[PDB]
Amino acid sequence: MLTKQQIRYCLDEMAKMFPDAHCELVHRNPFELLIAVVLSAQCTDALVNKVTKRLFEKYRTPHDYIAVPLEELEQDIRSIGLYRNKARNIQKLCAMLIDKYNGEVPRDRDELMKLPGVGRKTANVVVSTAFGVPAIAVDTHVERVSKRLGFCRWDDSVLEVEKTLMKIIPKEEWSITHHRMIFFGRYHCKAQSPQCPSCPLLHLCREGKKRMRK
DNA sequence: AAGACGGGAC
DNA sequence: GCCAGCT
Ligand code: SF4
Ligand code: NA
């Protein structure tokens, strides 16, 4: 594992490759963000944006979603994949907003997790992006990056990764940091073929060196 | 707690 | 013919 100073180093380095890193899910309000992320599970942001482009014009409120039969909503998000559970989740999710959350989107991370299709990662993205509540959402790109660079053990839970990062990054930079990591991994340290050869972090990256040899 | 859910880049 | 998080 890397020292805290080296992880701070690494992050700072990522903050130079991606100064304007941000959430790529296109949204206009917390409600649209929430649906977007839910639709995100095991799916590219690019594709989600492609679909919500039209989806968010037909549906704009929790009442709009629960007004149509499951079938319809399913076809509206057919391209996404996992559209059955997602369609059922969204409708139930919208019902809850109405029944227990005064028709709005709750700003409490744990509360969000009560929503179907909304896990910790999803809940963290929402509080942080929509509500400014510092939080580190650990997703495929954050987990991989953390593990290859040695931010943590190759065997830690996403939760352990989250706690690890929280211990390091100042509360004030969790969100932005998280975003830079996503970018660093989505666009550089890519799962399929990482750009190790030109990686500013190859010098302290066990995964890079290992990949360079092989 | 493994398994089930279901367009794009090689 | 691997990559993008509830029961
Ligand atoms: S060296 Fe390679 S594997 Fe390590 S962070 Fe850079 S691109 Fe990722
Ligand atoms: Na949930």
Give a verbal description of the structure.
It is classed as hydrolase/dna. The entry lists the keywords DNA repair, DNA glycosylase, [4FE-4S] cluster. The assembly is trimeric. The entry is titled "Structure of a non-covalent Endonuclease III-DNA Complex". The protein is Endonuclease III. Organism: Geobacillus stearothermophilus. The structure is a monomer. The protein is mainly α and 214 residues long. It has two domains: 22-133, Endonuclease III, domain 1; 2-21 and 134-213, Orthogonal Bundle (Endonuclease Iii, domain 2), CATH 1.10.1670.10. The chain contains twelve helices and no strands. It has helices spanning 4-17, 30-40, 45-58, 62-66, 70-76, 83-100, 109-113, 120-131, 140-149, 158-168, 174-187, 206-213. Helix 1 (4-17) crosses helix 11 (174-187) and helix 9 (140-149) crosses helix 11 (174-187). The chain is elongated, with a radius of gyration of 18 Å. It binds iron/sulfur cluster and sodium ion. Sodium ion (NA) is lined by residues 113-116, 118-119. Residues 148-149, 188-189, 194-196, 199, 201-202, 205, 207-208, 211 line the site of iron/sulfur cluster. The protein binds a DNA duplex (10 and 7 nucleotides) through residues 37-38, 40-47, 50, 78-86, 89, 116-117, 119-122, 139-141, 158, 186, 190-193.
